[PDB]
Copies of this chain bind each other. A is one copy, B any other.
Amino acid sequence: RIFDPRGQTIHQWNKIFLVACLISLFVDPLFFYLPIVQDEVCIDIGIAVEVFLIIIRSIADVFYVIHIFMRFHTAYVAPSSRVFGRGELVIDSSKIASRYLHKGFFLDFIAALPLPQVLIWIVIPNLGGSTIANTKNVLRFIIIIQYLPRLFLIFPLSSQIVKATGVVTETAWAGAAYNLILYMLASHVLGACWYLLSIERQEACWKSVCKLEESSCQFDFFDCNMVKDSLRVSWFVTSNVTNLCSPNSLFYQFGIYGDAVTSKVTTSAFFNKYFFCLWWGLRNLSSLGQGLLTSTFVGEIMFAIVIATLGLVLFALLIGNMQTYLQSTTVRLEEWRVKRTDTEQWMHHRQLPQELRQSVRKYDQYKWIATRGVDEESLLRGLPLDLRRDIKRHLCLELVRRVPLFDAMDERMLDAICERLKPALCTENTYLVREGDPVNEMLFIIRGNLDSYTTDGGRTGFFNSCRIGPGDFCGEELLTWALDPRPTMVIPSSTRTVKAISEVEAFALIAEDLKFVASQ
């Protein structure tokens, strides 16, 4: 029943468990929005939203338990060096169990037990008190103490997911969306923390007001289960806490939660306040923490400093990721620009003539348009013998079948010619091979129209001008070289004037290549 580390079952399980962990990290901070402040100056907790969040977190936690179960029945590749083979997987249950308990089980278990699920639904009635609402506001430390192990373990899991899937994306879409996903998650967490802290500070303000009016107030009057008491309503109508605990008054510094209290975010429905808190987190994380006009209290200042540093790190990482995206997108255009700048500066230093200057840049433009960087030969030797030989045969089969000698011959030397064949490029009105010049390039025309004429060695009259097009033959003198049994070295004078009249791409090949092939 032990699953192989690289089995597809483990891969799909890790994928769906990454999805489940993202759901867990999105849902856990939502427990901070449970408290609701009503108009009667009371703190109540929505039962329906609490039940929904408890159910969702129970599903997430049972998924975590299933992950623990699966990881407790998986094999690990033993660090055996050996010489050959890779099957160092351990099928013994005791060995894999000891390996997992030595490292991995503690952090994966401290973040999997449903302690938040129980201490809200089974412990609060059992807790030493009869007030559910009050003892659920400051003691929500379990969420933030179990969130850290989950947020820590989410990174290595994503590392294995992106490692075991080949390339993450096409150019950088995954690399840019991952940081935005983490960024939205950080915004959500900060918004939930901000709402909880605003509720805490508003409760502190209410406690301060009760201390100011201790004659007819006691600390538990702000519990919303006691709002119906006659003493509660009498104190509420007599007291003026609904005005004192407001940012407009100077009684108590609300700091950055004055924005929460003024906007009445603590009294609205769940969706409205959730979206407001998420936007607040996004805004104060994106603006680098500016606008957090905090007060002289250590907790709120620490929260603001954490927000500012997290915003710095996340914004800088986003800028870096988008820079990497752009570099991956262009990369080739940048090198082409560098080459064009170099070939425009060098020809300026040497003071080339204008009539010849407009030719090198035209050839460079032709090369970029018809090839788009991509060094043919460097990428060509990278492929194996099978793939390289097959692709060279497929690309140039009818081209080599036009040669009278190569047509009726075995594939032994044919594939030798195909493998060693090289690309060729030529711009418009290029006198490719004038009559007389040595012919040491064997060109096969793959695209374009050519013109080649023989003026009887230099005499006007009988012309050999042929409208050579794609898939034609040229340089027959090198074929005469290949056909000559004697290993001579005297270069043949060109008998024709090969000129590139049109938009032409060719396939040049070295004369010594024919010499070596014929020598075999």
Contact = CB atoms under 8 A, between A and B. Distances in A.
A331 B340 CA distance: 12
A338 B328 CA distance: 7
Contacts of A471: 83-85
Contact of A86 (B81, B82, B171, B447): B447
Interface string A278-291: 11001100111111
B81 A351 contact: yes
A332 B339 CA distance: 10
A395 B304 contact: no
B349 A166 contact: no
Interface in A424-481: 424-427, 430-433, 438, 440-441, 445-447, 470-471
Looking at A317, A319, A394, which has the most chain B CB atoms within 10 Å of its CB? A319
A278 B305 contact: yes
A387 B360 contact: yes
A346 B324 contact: no
A146 interface: no
A424 B80 contact: no
A289 B289 contact: no
A385 interface: yes
A428 B456 CA distance: 55
Given A86-B447, A349-B371, A371-B349, A296 B322 contact: no
Contacts of A326: 317, 320-321, 323-324
A188 to B, nearest CB: 11
Given A316-B322, A387-B359, A395 B271 contact: no
A115 interface: no
Contacts of A323: 316, 319-320, 323-324, 326
Mostly, the A contact residues are helix
Contact of A290 (B283, B336, B385, B394): B283
Given A166-B368, A343-B379, A391-B352, A327 B324 contact: yes
A328 B332 contact: no
Interface residues of A, number: 134
Contacts of A445: 84
A93 interface: no
A85 B283 contact: no
Contacts of A383: 360, 363
Interface of A: 79-86, 166-168, 170-172, 175, 180, 183, 253, 259, 263-265, 268, 271-273, 275-276, 278-279, 282-283, 286-298, 301-302, 304-305, 308-309, 311-313, 315-328, 330-334, 336-343, 345-346, 349-353, 356, 359-360, 363, 365, 367-374, 376, 379, 382-387, 390-391, 394-399, 412, 424-427, 430-433, 438, 440-441, 445-447, 470-471
19 contacts: A83-B398, A170-B341, A183-B312, A263-B296, A275-B298, A276-B301, A279-B305, A279-B308, A287-B288, A287-B290, A313-B322, A319-B323, A323-B326, A332-B338, A356-B394, A360-B387, A363-B383, A385-B440, A386-B432
